[PDB]
Nucleic acid binder design. Structure first.
Ligand SMILES: [Ca+2]
Ligand SMILES: [Ca+2]
Ligand SMILES: [Ca+2]
Ligand SMILES: [Ca+2]
Lengths: 163, 163
DNA sequence: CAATCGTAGGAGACTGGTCTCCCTGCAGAT
DNA sequence: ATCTGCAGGGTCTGGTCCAGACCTACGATTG
């Protein structure tokens, strides 16, 4: 009963669901780096692999990861960064012994009846709250939608149902 | 000691120099995948990790990797792929215990005096052949530039000089 | 630190200037 | 297969193509 869920973006997170119902969710580690004489955020490769090595999740545990489908109206930098975060997470998860399953956001949103929402990120946090009430405190802020995403991805993988 | 050189893109390659002088170079493993109704080539995560784990270079071996820097005039698909390749390789290298050092193409080309060449890819292959004569049979085709790049990036990190 | 808003953008090496560098993706011809 | 050439491009899930859905990065200003 082990499932991992990853929202790989910069504001994303990794969630881990244990057989006994317990869950953990961690903000994606990032660093500030110099690019074209400005500072940009980038996922912290060594920290992520350090995180994944310290999980009690056994090797072979399925990880569900949201696939990057950036909009054509998004800038080239957005396309590069979402590509880069996707690749860094995929390899980190495979190298750590996990079976990787990409999932489009329409898939898990459709499973939880969240498509076409007027406030998708607040609704994401509400759903994760109801599926994981012990993470309620860790979902209070609007900036926590990444923790919720990761949690809903894992819930999707586990087969959980909203009441 | 040991030096790794990686050209990270789809036509790219990984080179490995031993302290004893013997060199190895392998084409980047890739797979065909469906994207938006067409086939696209994509680096093969599990093969890369499988490859890295089979190397004899010890942990802490420095891995020089070519820094992604797509042209602003390149398409957004190009921006995403180079980002993805770059992220998949970095994480793979870190997970295998290597110390990753990103190098701009201008740095290794200037070292070997290859800047502002009208046939850069031919030139790379000729220099790699001079630097690694037993790799001559592996550099004879024009599509082999990636092998040569990887070899020249590694030759840069080892401090080898052209005659 | 937490939120909202608008747009979609190069980056890199040797007191700023100047010059450099790819890649993807798709079609064709042999 | 190898190469040359040229432009810079969404992608996804699901019910013979296509509808209708989905972000993200990167800076600003507000407190
Ligand atoms: Ca998302
Ligand atoms: Ca997110
Ligand atoms: Ca290159
Ligand atoms: Ca290359």
């Amino acid at each position: 009963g082990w499932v991992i869920g990853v929202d790989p973006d910069i504001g994303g997170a990794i969630a881990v669901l244990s057989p006994d119902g317990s869950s953990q969710v961690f903000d994606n580690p990032f660093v500030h780096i110099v690019v074209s004489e400005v500072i940009r955020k980038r996922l912290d490769t060594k920290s992520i692999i350090q995180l994944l090595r310290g999980l009690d999740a056994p090797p072979g545990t399925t990880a569900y990861i949201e696939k990057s489908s950036p909009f054509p109206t998004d800038g080239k930098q957005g396309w590069w960064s979402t590509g880069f975060s996707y690749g860094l997470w995929i390899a980190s998860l495979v190298a750590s012994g996990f079976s990787v399953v990409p999932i489009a956001s329409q898939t898990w949103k459709a499973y939880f009846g969240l498509m076409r929402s007027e406030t998708p990120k607040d609704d994401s946090r509400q759903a994760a709250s109801i599926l994981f009430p012990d993470k309620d405190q860790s979902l209070k802020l609007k900036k926590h939608h990444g923790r919720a995403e990761a949690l809903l991805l894992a819930a999707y993988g586990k087969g959980l149902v909203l009441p």
